[PDB]
């Protein structure tokens, strides 16, 4: 859970039904969410495997 693991989920103004995965710093585990399509943030992944191996790690 390095730096790109602190800023919380940010969907932004758009609401494009683009489902994505993110790192839940509230409990220390990756989880699922919805991306608007514009103005995303660092906390952003495409698969839980991706977020766990990248931000999760441990």
Curated annotation (Swiss-Prot):
Subcellular location: Secreted
Domain BPTI/Kunitz inhibitor: 5-55
Keyword Transit peptide attributed: no
Primary subcellular site in the record, as a coarse category: secreted
Disulfide bonds: 5-55, 14-38, 30-51
Superkingdom, taxonomy of origin: Eukaryota
Gene Ontology BP terms: negative regulation of platelet aggregation; negative regulation of serine-type endopeptidase activity; negative regulation of thrombin-activated receptor signaling pathway; trypsinogen activation
Protein name: Pancreatic trypsin inhibitor
Organism: Bos taurus (Bovine)
Lineage of origin: Eukaryota, Metazoa, Chordata, Craniata, Vertebrata
């Amino acid at each position: 859970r390095p730096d790109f693991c602190l800023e919380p989920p940010y969907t932004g103004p758009c609401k494009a039904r683009i489902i994505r995965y993110f790192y839940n710093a509230k409990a220390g585990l990756c989880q699922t969410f919805v991306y608007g399509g514009c103005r995303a943030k660092r906390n952003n992944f495409k698969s839980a495997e991706d977020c766990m191996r990248t931000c999760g790690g441990a």
